[PDB]
Amino acid sequence: KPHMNLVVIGHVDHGKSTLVGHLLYRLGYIEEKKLKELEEQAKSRGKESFKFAWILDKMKEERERGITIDLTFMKFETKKYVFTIIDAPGHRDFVKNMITGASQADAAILVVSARKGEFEAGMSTEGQTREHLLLARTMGIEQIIVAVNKMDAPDVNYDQKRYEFVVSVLKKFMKGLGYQVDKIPFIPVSAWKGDNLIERSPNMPWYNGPTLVEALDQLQPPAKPVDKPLRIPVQNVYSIPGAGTVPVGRVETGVLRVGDKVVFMPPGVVGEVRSIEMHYQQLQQAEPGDNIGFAVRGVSKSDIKRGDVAGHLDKPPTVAEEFEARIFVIWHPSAITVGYTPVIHVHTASVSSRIIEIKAKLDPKTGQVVEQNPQFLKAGDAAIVRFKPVKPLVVEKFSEIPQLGRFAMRDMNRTVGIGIVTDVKPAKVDIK
Amino acid sequence: SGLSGMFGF
Amino acid sequence: SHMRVEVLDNKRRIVRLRPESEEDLWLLRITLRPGDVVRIRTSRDVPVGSGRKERVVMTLRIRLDSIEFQPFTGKLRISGIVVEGPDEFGVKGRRHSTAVSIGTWLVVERDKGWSEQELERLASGRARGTAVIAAVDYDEFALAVLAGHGMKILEDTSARLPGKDDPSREQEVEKYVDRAAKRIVEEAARHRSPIAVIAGPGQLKTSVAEKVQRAMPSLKVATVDTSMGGVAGVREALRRESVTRILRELSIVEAEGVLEEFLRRIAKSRDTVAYTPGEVLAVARMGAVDTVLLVDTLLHSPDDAVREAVDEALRLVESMGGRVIIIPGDSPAGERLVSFGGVIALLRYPVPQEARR
Ligand SMILES: Nc1nc2c(ncn2[C@@H]2O[C@H](COP(=O)(O)OP(=O)(O)OP(=O)(O)O)[C@@H](O)[C@H]2O)c(=O)[nH]1
Ligand SMILES: [Mg+2]
Ligand code: NA
């Protein structure tokens, strides 16, 4: 069984967590006693219909707000594949976590809501059906399944007129981003009632397309960039007794084996890998695809954190003192200039980086040096610029390691632009 | 808006 | 409150003043100039006896050579060659470096006379306080102390928090909101801050806000919505509508809204702004400038030509009822001004580029 990382994206309360909640319960993985225990507590607070969501959502704020905030990781398997499913947050305040999830994803489920106003809020200027589709694309997610959720709702009622209409507007938008619009399944489902999740819904005989499980098995596994350096961007870092300090992350490139001495950049801390765990399975090695926990002798919890990237000492990950990049400005209120310092989201990292130069402007539909050292960039422009990270950042050239060299520029609770890194002035490798 | 930009994506 | 400014002689070349706030030290930094002679009572070591020295307090007049001001120190640091002092100590012609404090009487003389605008500016320092701004999310906490004339990041921490699946994650965020709240209260005390703005996404900022109100009920506390924590979140808060109302008297903050207006114009209506010392001066003579945003280092540039040119423009815009906003280059607004020669101006009408002499 090959392995694939699935990420769940969509606008706030369009039904990501209940989809993953109910989909697991139907495939067997949620206990009856647990599901109803969650229903009772859900009901005891003013949150009756968040029973499936509370399998995924856990924090004090997540349960009080009824909002996914950080990524929840879970495991299941179909006929053909075994999945790491990654329930990501909808709310605009936490799209930085959606990006860290998107950087690990081999494919995505775009949960869109067929309810009136909710689809429109998802696809408006500042919506997240739109933004997560943008961000998912730039982070490397090529495969995509879309689930037109909430078909059962009073203001929809299993309607085809709605399903055809919502698919129409998404098809127009995604073909702009450069997606294979005829090749991706648009599944009218209900996450709450469970329609089309595993077995065909009687309530939509007009459908004739694949169900969510049948669409999951449709997905092809990704290629494996082996014959490349070791890159494991860390997602989290735990202190689990029986193991010590164990960072968790997806391996993007190379091969991690037990006993390998590893270095975590930017900190420069070195540690021996003592064990490798994936879905509670003991591994002697991990390869591109594998989202693993890996214990490390020598490193402590205070030494490393999310955004740090692990590699062998042979060729450690590049710490960019400065870095050059080609970018495209999606939105900006006024104008971008030398000095501007948006947050650069690469792999699992989110680091402010000052634009220290604008080397050239470029035409957005072609891309040749129109102007040289322009005074400003505005929305709709593309350009070559030189960043200086406000704090130590790991990036890599897009030519060499594209997954560590593709990024979003965010600022002011909006995505300003997107870009790839074309050069890196590296930092002084400072090992202990 | 006009967002048809590929960086070899 | 405001600086006691008091013109002495007939020709209005001499002024006697006493800074009574840190804003009054800032006003001295933006006002004073290499060539002014201050008259301060300082101490200076002098060789008296045989192989022996005594710290003897004395009155000196010093031809100013250097004016530097580090924020949140209560010290305008001055230096220069002593032009007059007691004759037995032999100090005339020697360098005296020292520091003007809050409470320090100093008389200062300008050869070509003090203007009415210069004095008005010198007496403008209604002693505005010094807020603290912080930002909290699950990844980061930062805290900074904000004056009109300076900003300083006092804390910048990563909440190296467990993954939400980890047991004890819930108690670890509790310790983290205590550690954050503690540090806010600590520095609001250390800086005598009336307001404390707390940025962040969601409930963490309110959790932290409650803890500081508990430990300081006299302290005002604002919660501002914001996309992220850390220094970015602090810098994000400075541009929000909320904070521009609550801290509207702070240049640093004021600067960001004109800068935004200047840049919104550079895209569309290029002729309704100007930048760079000479182009600003050109349109300032015309009576075109509404407000001028300025980096404070231009006032002290080692080139004589630009200190005179920048002063002429500033004098001109305020002579025709324009605003003049002076800020540190070491600030979030200040950083964007480097590519515009340190100065930007908003114009009251379009001035074509071939008309700017
Ligand atoms: N009628 C109906 N309601 C749904 C469905 N799916 C979700 N909901 C409701 O939508 C609300 C939010 O559900 P969640 O699964 O938390 O939505 P989410 O997208 O995971 O939330 P975020 O991750 O914070 O964006 C709850 O009140 C659910 O009952 C559905 O298929 N049908
Ligand atoms: Mg969710
Ligand atoms: Na939700």
Coordinates of C-alpha atoms in Angstrom, one line a residue, chain A residues 9-431:
Chain A
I9 CA -9.1 23.0 3.0
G10 CA -12.0 25.4 2.7
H11 CA -13.8 28.5 4.0
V12 CA -14.7 28.9 7.7
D13 CA -17.4 26.4 8.9
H14 CA -17.9 24.8 5.4
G15 CA -17.5 21.4 7.1
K16 CA -13.9 20.2 6.9
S17 CA -13.7 18.7 10.4
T18 CA -17.1 17.0 10.3
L19 CA -16.2 15.5 6.9
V20 CA -13.0 13.9 8.3
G21 CA -14.9 13.1 11.5
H22 CA -17.8 11.3 9.8
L23 CA -15.6 9.7 7.0
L24 CA -13.5 8.0 9.7
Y25 CA -16.6 6.8 11.6
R26 CA -18.0 5.2 8.5
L27 CA -14.7 3.6 7.5
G28 CA -14.6 2.1 11.1
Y29 CA -12.0 4.1 13.0
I30 CA -14.2 6.0 15.5
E31 CA -15.7 4.1 18.4
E32 CA -19.5 4.2 19.1
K33 CA -18.9 5.0 22.8
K34 CA -16.5 7.9 21.8
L35 CA -18.8 9.5 19.2
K36 CA -21.7 9.7 21.6
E37 CA -19.5 10.9 24.5
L38 CA -18.5 13.8 22.2
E39 CA -22.2 14.4 21.3
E40 CA -23.1 14.7 25.0
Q41 CA -20.3 17.3 25.8
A42 CA -21.1 19.0 22.5
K43 CA -24.8 19.2 23.6
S44 CA -23.8 20.3 27.2
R45 CA -22.2 23.4 25.6
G46 CA -24.1 25.4 23.0
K47 CA -22.4 23.4 20.3
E48 CA -24.8 20.5 19.5
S49 CA -23.8 19.8 15.8
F50 CA -20.0 19.7 16.3
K51 CA -19.9 16.0 17.3
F52 CA -17.9 14.8 14.3
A53 CA -15.7 17.9 14.4
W54 CA -14.6 17.2 18.0
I55 CA -12.8 14.1 16.9
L56 CA -10.3 16.5 15.3
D57 CA -10.8 19.8 17.2
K58 CA -9.4 19.7 20.7
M59 CA -8.0 23.0 22.1
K60 CA -9.9 25.1 24.7
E61 CA -10.4 27.8 22.0
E62 CA -11.2 25.3 19.2
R63 CA -14.1 23.8 21.2
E64 CA -15.4 27.1 22.6
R65 CA -15.3 28.8 19.2
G66 CA -16.2 25.7 17.1
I67 CA -13.1 26.5 15.0
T68 CA -10.2 24.4 13.9
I69 CA -7.0 26.4 14.7
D70 CA -4.0 24.1 14.2
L71 CA -3.5 21.0 12.1
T72 CA -4.9 17.7 13.4
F73 CA -3.2 14.6 12.0
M74 CA -5.0 11.2 11.5
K75 CA -4.6 7.9 9.8
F76 CA -6.8 5.6 7.7
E77 CA -6.6 3.5 4.6
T78 CA -8.7 2.6 1.5
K79 CA -8.5 -0.3 -1.0
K80 CA -5.3 0.9 -2.6
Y81 CA -3.7 3.6 -0.4
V82 CA -2.9 4.5 3.3
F83 CA -3.5 8.2 4.1
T84 CA -2.2 10.8 6.6
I85 CA -5.2 13.1 6.6
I86 CA -4.5 16.6 7.8
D87 CA -7.6 18.6 9.0
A88 CA -6.6 22.3 8.4
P89 CA -8.2 25.5 9.7
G90 CA -10.7 27.6 7.7
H91 CA -10.7 30.9 9.6
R92 CA -8.6 33.7 8.1
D93 CA -6.6 34.2 11.3
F94 CA -4.9 30.8 11.0
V95 CA -4.1 30.4 7.3
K96 CA -0.4 30.2 8.4
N97 CA -1.2 26.6 9.7
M98 CA -3.2 25.8 6.6
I99 CA 0.1 26.6 4.7
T100 CA 2.2 24.3 6.9
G101 CA -0.4 21.6 6.2
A102 CA -0.5 22.4 2.5
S103 CA 3.4 22.2 2.2
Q104 CA 3.1 18.5 3.3
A105 CA 0.1 17.6 1.1
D106 CA 0.4 15.3 -1.9
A107 CA -3.3 16.1 -2.7
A108 CA -6.2 18.0 -1.2
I109 CA -9.9 17.8 -0.4
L110 CA -11.5 21.3 -1.0
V111 CA -14.6 21.4 1.2
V112 CA -17.0 23.9 -0.2
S113 CA -20.5 24.7 1.2
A114 CA -23.6 24.7 -1.0
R115 CA -25.5 26.9 1.5
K116 CA -26.7 30.4 0.4
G117 CA -24.2 33.2 1.3
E118 CA -21.6 30.6 2.5
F119 CA -20.5 29.7 -1.1
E120 CA -20.5 33.4 -1.9
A121 CA -18.4 34.2 1.2
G122 CA -16.1 31.4 0.3
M123 CA -15.5 32.7 -3.3
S124 CA -15.6 36.5 -2.6
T125 CA -12.4 38.7 -2.8
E126 CA -11.3 37.9 0.8
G127 CA -12.8 34.4 1.0
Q128 CA -10.9 31.2 1.7
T129 CA -12.3 28.8 -0.9
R130 CA -10.4 31.3 -3.2
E131 CA -7.4 31.8 -0.9
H132 CA -6.7 28.2 0.1
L133 CA -7.0 27.2 -3.6
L134 CA -4.5 29.9 -4.4
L135 CA -2.2 28.9 -1.5
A136 CA -2.6 25.1 -2.2
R137 CA -1.5 25.7 -5.8
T138 CA 1.6 27.7 -4.9
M139 CA 2.7 25.2 -2.2
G140 CA 2.8 22.4 -4.8
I141 CA -0.6 20.5 -4.5
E142 CA -1.3 19.3 -8.0
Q143 CA -4.0 16.7 -7.2
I144 CA -7.4 17.9 -5.8
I145 CA -10.8 16.4 -5.0
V146 CA -13.6 18.9 -4.2
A147 CA -16.5 18.0 -1.9
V148 CA -19.6 20.2 -2.4
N149 CA -20.7 19.8 1.3
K150 CA -24.0 20.5 3.1
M151 CA -26.3 19.2 0.4
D152 CA -28.9 18.1 3.0
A153 CA -29.3 21.7 4.4
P154 CA -32.9 23.3 4.5
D155 CA -31.8 26.1 2.0
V156 CA -30.4 23.6 -0.5
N157 CA -32.2 20.2 -0.1
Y158 CA -30.2 17.9 -2.4
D159 CA -30.6 20.3 -5.3
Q160 CA -28.9 19.9 -8.7
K161 CA -29.4 23.5 -9.7
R162 CA -27.1 24.5 -6.9
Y163 CA -24.5 21.8 -7.5
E164 CA -24.1 22.6 -11.2
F165 CA -23.9 26.4 -10.4
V166 CA -21.2 26.1 -7.6
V167 CA -19.2 23.7 -9.8
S168 CA -19.4 26.2 -12.7
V169 CA -17.8 29.1 -10.6
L170 CA -15.1 26.8 -9.2
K171 CA -14.3 25.4 -12.6
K172 CA -13.8 29.0 -14.0
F173 CA -11.6 30.0 -11.1
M174 CA -9.4 26.9 -10.9
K175 CA -8.6 26.9 -14.7
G176 CA -7.1 30.4 -14.0
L177 CA -4.8 28.8 -11.5
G178 CA -4.0 26.2 -14.1
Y179 CA -5.8 23.1 -12.8
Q180 CA -7.0 20.1 -14.7
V181 CA -10.7 21.0 -14.3
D182 CA -12.2 18.1 -16.3
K183 CA -9.9 15.6 -14.4
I184 CA -11.0 16.4 -10.8
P185 CA -14.2 15.0 -9.1
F186 CA -16.8 17.4 -7.7
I187 CA -18.7 15.3 -5.2
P188 CA -22.0 16.6 -3.7
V189 CA -21.8 15.2 -0.1
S190 CA -23.2 15.8 3.3
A191 CA -20.6 15.6 6.1
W192 CA -23.3 15.7 8.8
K193 CA -25.7 13.1 7.4
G194 CA -22.9 11.1 5.7
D195 CA -24.2 11.2 2.1
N196 CA -21.8 10.1 -0.6
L197 CA -18.9 9.6 1.9
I198 CA -18.6 5.8 1.5
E199 CA -21.8 4.4 -0.1
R200 CA -24.0 6.2 -2.8
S201 CA -26.6 8.6 -1.6
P202 CA -30.1 7.6 -2.4
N203 CA -31.0 11.4 -2.2
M204 CA -29.0 12.4 -5.3
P205 CA -29.7 9.8 -8.1
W206 CA -28.9 12.5 -10.7
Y207 CA -25.2 12.5 -9.6
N208 CA -23.5 9.6 -11.5
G209 CA -19.9 10.5 -10.3
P210 CA -17.5 8.9 -7.8
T211 CA -18.0 8.9 -4.0
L212 CA -15.3 10.3 -1.7
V213 CA -13.7 6.9 -1.0
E214 CA -13.8 6.0 -4.7
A215 CA -12.3 9.4 -5.5
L216 CA -9.5 8.7 -2.9
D217 CA -8.5 5.5 -4.7
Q218 CA -8.5 7.5 -8.0
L219 CA -5.6 9.6 -6.8
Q220 CA -2.1 8.6 -8.2
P221 CA 0.9 8.5 -5.8
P222 CA 3.5 11.2 -6.1
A223 CA 7.1 10.9 -7.4
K224 CA 9.9 10.3 -4.9
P225 CA 12.7 12.9 -5.0
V226 CA 15.4 10.4 -3.7
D227 CA 18.9 11.1 -5.0
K228 CA 18.8 14.5 -3.2
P229 CA 19.8 15.8 0.2
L230 CA 17.9 15.1 3.3
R231 CA 15.2 17.7 4.1
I232 CA 12.7 17.3 6.9
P233 CA 10.9 20.5 7.8
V234 CA 9.7 20.1 11.4
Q235 CA 6.0 20.5 12.1
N236 CA 6.1 20.2 15.9
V237 CA 8.4 19.1 18.6
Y238 CA 7.2 16.9 21.5
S239 CA 8.8 15.7 24.8
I240 CA 7.4 12.2 25.0
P241 CA 8.7 10.1 27.9
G242 CA 10.1 6.8 26.7
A243 CA 11.8 8.7 23.9
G244 CA 13.1 12.1 24.8
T245 CA 12.6 15.1 22.4
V246 CA 10.9 14.0 19.2
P247 CA 10.4 16.4 16.3
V248 CA 7.6 15.4 13.9
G249 CA 7.6 16.3 10.2
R250 CA 7.2 15.2 6.6
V251 CA 10.3 14.1 4.7
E252 CA 10.4 16.1 1.5
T253 CA 13.7 14.8 0.0
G254 CA 16.4 12.2 0.8
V255 CA 16.4 9.2 3.2
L256 CA 16.5 9.4 7.0
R257 CA 17.6 6.1 8.7
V258 CA 18.0 5.3 12.4
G259 CA 21.4 6.1 13.8
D260 CA 22.0 9.0 11.3
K261 CA 23.4 12.1 12.9
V262 CA 21.2 15.0 11.9
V263 CA 21.5 18.8 12.1
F264 CA 18.6 21.2 12.6
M265 CA 18.9 24.5 10.8
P266 CA 18.8 27.4 11.6
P267 CA 19.7 26.5 15.3
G268 CA 22.7 24.4 14.2
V269 CA 22.0 21.7 16.8
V270 CA 23.2 18.2 16.0
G271 CA 21.5 15.0 17.2
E272 CA 21.6 11.3 16.7
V273 CA 18.3 9.8 15.4
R274 CA 17.4 7.0 17.9
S275 CA 14.1 5.8 16.5
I276 CA 11.5 6.5 13.7
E277 CA 7.7 6.2 14.3
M278 CA 4.9 6.7 11.7
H279 CA 1.3 5.9 12.7
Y280 CA 2.8 4.2 15.7
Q281 CA 4.8 1.8 13.4
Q282 CA 8.5 1.3 14.0
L283 CA 10.6 2.2 10.9
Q284 CA 14.3 1.7 10.3
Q285 CA 14.1 4.4 7.6
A286 CA 11.8 7.1 6.1
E287 CA 11.7 8.4 2.6
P288 CA 9.9 11.2 0.6
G289 CA 6.2 11.0 1.5
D290 CA 6.6 9.7 5.1
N291 CA 5.2 12.0 7.8
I292 CA 7.2 10.7 10.8
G293 CA 8.1 11.3 14.4
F294 CA 11.8 10.7 15.0
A295 CA 13.5 10.7 18.4
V296 CA 16.8 12.5 18.7
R297 CA 19.5 12.1 21.4
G298 CA 21.2 15.3 22.3
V299 CA 18.7 17.9 21.1
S300 CA 16.2 19.4 23.7
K301 CA 12.7 20.9 23.3
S302 CA 14.0 24.4 23.7
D303 CA 16.6 24.0 20.9
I304 CA 14.2 23.4 18.0
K305 CA 10.7 24.4 16.7
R306 CA 8.4 24.5 13.7
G307 CA 10.0 26.0 10.6
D308 CA 13.4 24.4 11.4
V309 CA 14.6 21.9 8.8
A310 CA 16.5 18.8 9.5
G311 CA 19.2 17.3 7.3
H312 CA 22.5 15.3 7.3
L313 CA 25.8 17.0 8.1
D314 CA 27.0 16.0 4.6
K315 CA 25.0 19.0 3.2
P316 CA 23.0 20.8 5.9
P317 CA 19.9 22.9 4.9
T318 CA 20.8 26.4 3.6
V319 CA 20.2 29.2 6.1
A320 CA 19.5 32.3 3.9
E321 CA 21.3 35.4 5.2
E322 CA 19.7 37.0 2.2
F323 CA 17.8 35.4 -0.8
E324 CA 16.8 36.4 -4.3
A325 CA 13.3 35.5 -5.7
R326 CA 10.9 36.0 -8.6
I327 CA 7.5 37.1 -7.3
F328 CA 4.0 38.1 -8.4
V329 CA 1.9 40.6 -6.5
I330 CA -1.7 39.5 -6.1
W331 CA -3.0 42.2 -3.7
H332 CA -1.5 45.2 -1.9
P333 CA -3.3 48.3 -0.6
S334 CA -0.8 50.9 -1.8
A335 CA 2.6 49.9 -3.3
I336 CA 5.5 47.6 -2.4
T337 CA 8.9 49.3 -2.0
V338 CA 12.4 48.7 -0.7
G339 CA 12.0 48.3 3.1
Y340 CA 8.7 46.3 2.9
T341 CA 8.7 43.3 5.3
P342 CA 5.9 40.8 4.7
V343 CA 5.8 37.3 6.2
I344 CA 7.4 34.6 3.9
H345 CA 5.7 31.3 4.2
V346 CA 8.0 28.5 3.0
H347 CA 7.6 24.8 3.9
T348 CA 6.6 24.8 7.6
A349 CA 8.2 28.2 8.3
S350 CA 6.6 31.7 8.5
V351 CA 9.3 34.4 8.8
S352 CA 9.2 38.2 8.1
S353 CA 11.8 39.1 5.4
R354 CA 12.7 42.7 4.4
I355 CA 12.8 43.6 0.7
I356 CA 16.3 45.1 0.6
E357 CA 16.1 45.6 -3.2
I358 CA 13.8 45.5 -6.2
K359 CA 16.2 44.4 -9.0
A360 CA 13.7 44.5 -11.9
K361 CA 10.0 44.7 -12.8
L362 CA 8.6 42.1 -15.2
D363 CA 5.5 41.7 -17.4
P364 CA 2.9 39.5 -15.7
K365 CA 1.9 37.6 -18.9
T366 CA 5.5 37.1 -20.3
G367 CA 8.3 38.1 -17.9
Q368 CA 11.2 40.1 -19.3
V369 CA 13.1 42.9 -17.6
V370 CA 10.8 45.9 -18.4
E371 CA 12.3 48.3 -15.8
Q372 CA 15.5 48.1 -13.7
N373 CA 15.5 49.1 -10.0
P374 CA 11.8 50.4 -10.1
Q375 CA 10.7 52.7 -7.3
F376 CA 7.7 50.5 -6.5
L377 CA 5.7 47.4 -7.3
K378 CA 1.9 47.3 -7.2
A379 CA -0.9 44.7 -7.5
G380 CA -0.7 42.9 -10.8
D381 CA 3.1 43.3 -11.2
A382 CA 5.7 40.6 -11.2
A383 CA 9.4 41.2 -10.4
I384 CA 12.9 40.1 -9.2
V385 CA 13.6 41.1 -5.6
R386 CA 16.2 40.5 -2.8
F387 CA 14.9 39.5 0.6
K388 CA 16.8 39.7 4.0
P389 CA 15.1 37.5 6.6
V390 CA 14.5 39.4 9.9
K391 CA 15.3 36.1 11.6
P392 CA 17.2 33.0 10.4
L393 CA 15.2 31.3 7.6
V394 CA 15.9 28.1 5.7
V395 CA 15.2 28.4 1.9
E396 CA 16.5 26.5 -1.1
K397 CA 16.5 27.3 -4.8
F398 CA 13.3 26.3 -6.6
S399 CA 15.5 24.6 -9.3
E400 CA 17.2 22.5 -6.6
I401 CA 14.5 21.7 -4.0
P402 CA 11.2 23.3 -5.3
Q403 CA 9.2 22.4 -2.1
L404 CA 11.7 24.5 0.0
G405 CA 11.8 27.2 -2.6
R406 CA 8.1 28.0 -3.3
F407 CA 6.5 30.6 -1.0
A408 CA 3.6 32.9 -0.2
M409 CA 4.0 36.5 0.9
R410 CA 1.5 37.5 3.5
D411 CA 0.9 40.7 5.4
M412 CA -2.1 42.2 7.2
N413 CA -4.3 39.1 7.3
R414 CA -4.1 38.8 3.5
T415 CA -1.9 37.1 0.9
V416 CA 0.1 39.8 -0.8
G417 CA 1.7 37.7 -3.4
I418 CA 3.5 34.4 -4.3
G419 CA 7.0 33.6 -5.4
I420 CA 9.9 31.1 -6.0
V421 CA 13.5 31.6 -4.8
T422 CA 16.1 31.9 -7.6
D423 CA 19.3 32.5 -5.5
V424 CA 20.5 32.3 -1.8
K425 CA 23.4 34.1 -0.1
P426 CA 23.9 31.5 2.6
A427 CA 24.7 32.2 6.3
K428 CA 27.7 31.3 8.5
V429 CA 27.2 27.6 9.4
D430 CA 27.6 27.8 13.2
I431 CA 27.7 24.3 14.7

